[PDB]
């Protein structure tokens, strides 16, 4: 890559916490990666991304300062008329990690992204907007929920009701906070979006034109020395027996795969911190790494 | 002191991020602190805060050392850190006032970096008791780690700094932002913390050792016993401790911005921390350490352990 513009992207990840790379990937390995796509399982179904990004990590690990592993690849699709999720910053995506320890994702469209149909992903400066403390106040709601009982009516609705700093803080808040300084830009194939765990951000709907659906995948990585969370953990067991007690079924978020192979490790008991100890991160080291 | 008991506050400081120590000061160094404030107060003209005395910096680093460097001691033991006498404050509070309402250290220890260390020994000079009150309530970290607190409110002091003439009477646009700041209102403190605070009662010679990610703010006091409660607050920082020179602009500025709206003359006490350390980070600063501030590296050792 021109290594001045790596020298800039070095730049821009320290100033904003994310960066947009243009041309990281080939077209053809684009077009492989998106023809093989049209061709505790779902931990691994997507492996095949893997050796893709792992030709990227030094990269990676140059413009952030870290020593990047790969923890999962997600693909997410979905039709052009989509309401996604409003700002957020991912306190569900890396619940598994320790707030204070590095986390960060890249957004790869499969599908291109233009000024029309936009349909791709808006994003805020950390010198704008710290995501950090919102992780706090996600804390400080889990353990608000976990203080129901059936004496107070349904869960579901104690949950969206409870008077919380997190549920305070409503679209309309956010989007005063933010403003008008956010970017948006436009994806060529073989460019990805890459952004630290802090970073505010939000998916853009979808124009009916083309295509049929937007296609992309986010890769979930954290640095050699990021530690699980023991205690959200604990917060999320807990509050998934009062729901199954209660609904007589599951909360969603048994959904997430890194959640439900990272909390059994846990709960097997864990000799370390680190996440890279988990037995099966640790067999899987070398191709989760930099070459 | 005890040993089984200087034990316990160091427990329960890593626990709460605060710890009473009662009959750490001896009666004639409260009275000492008494006289040598009412002097000081007296000299000087000083202007949702409803408290009597809100004064900073009234006293210098000597003075405090005087009666705080043995102490030293033991809060390095307690909180594990190296700790320097940084700056001060008096508050008092009169019958039937709400005081200062709940807050975390973002104000006192605005010219630092957050993740920095700070922390503040609070020394009441009238009793408190279960009866009058007028003391403080304060909530453990395990219950609102207060660190994120920090983000709010710069989140908020940037919103300020963006005030217009257009805009209209700055202290209404500043108390009816839609801020996060301004959304964390008592009630929601409240619904968070629940009973999770305590209140204690103190005897003179009893102070309150806090970092400055605790959350805290003033009891009324109960007419009957006292005409007014006073309070000397000494705020500490590490050896290691850092000037935030982007907070201490953002303080500037919208302190400036006020006082040009409202044509108001602030008034800071000779050798006042907060301009000490404006002056150097306006020359420009050597190191991002407050140690290496010239005139603090200079009496360094009375504001450090012995
Ligand atoms: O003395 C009081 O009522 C409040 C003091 C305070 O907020 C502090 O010492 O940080
Ligand atoms: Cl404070
Ligand atoms: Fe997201
Ligand atoms: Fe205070």
């Known amino acids: ?102 986390g960060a994702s890249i957004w790869i469209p499969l599908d291109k992204i233009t000024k029309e149909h936009r349909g791709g992903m808006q994003y805020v400066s950390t010198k704008i907007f710290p995501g950090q403390f919102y992780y706090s106040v996600f804390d400080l709601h889990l353990k608000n929920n976990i203080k129901w009982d059936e004496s107070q009516g349904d869960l579901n609705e104690y949950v969206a009701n409870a008077n919380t700093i997190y549920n305070k803080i409503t679209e309309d808040v956010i989007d005063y906070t933010i403003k008008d300084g956010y970017e948006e830009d436009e994806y060529n194939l073989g460019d990805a979006f890459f952004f630290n765990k802090y970073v505010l951000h939000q998916s853009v709907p979808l124009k009916p034109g083309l295509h049929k659906l937007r296609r992309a995948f986010v890769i979930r990585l954290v640095d050699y020395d990021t530690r699980v969370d023991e205690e959200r953990l604990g917060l999320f067991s807990k509050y998934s027996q009062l729901h199954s007690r209660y609904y007589k079924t599951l909360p969603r978020y048994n959904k997430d795969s890194v959640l439900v192979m990272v909390s059994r490790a846990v709960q097997k008991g864990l000799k370390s911190p680190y996440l890279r100890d988990i037995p099966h991160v640790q067999q899987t080291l070398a191709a989760r790494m930099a070459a």
């Not at 990227?56 to 997410?76: S, V």
Request: hydrophobic residues 35%.
């Open 1 to 102: 890559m021109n290594r001045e513009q790596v020298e800039q992207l070095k730049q821009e990840y320290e100033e904003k916490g994310y960066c947009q790379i243009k041309k990281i990937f080939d077209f053809s390995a684009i077009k492989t990666i998106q023809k093989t796509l049209d061709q505790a399982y779902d931990l691994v179904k997507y492996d095949f991304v893997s050796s893709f990004i792992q030709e990227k990590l030094a990269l990676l690990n140059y413009i952030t300062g870290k020593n990047l592993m790969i923890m999962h690849n997600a693909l997410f699709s979905v039709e052009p008329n989509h309401k996604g999720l409003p700002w957020h910053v991912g306190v569900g995506s890396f619940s598994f990690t320790k707030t204070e320890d590095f």
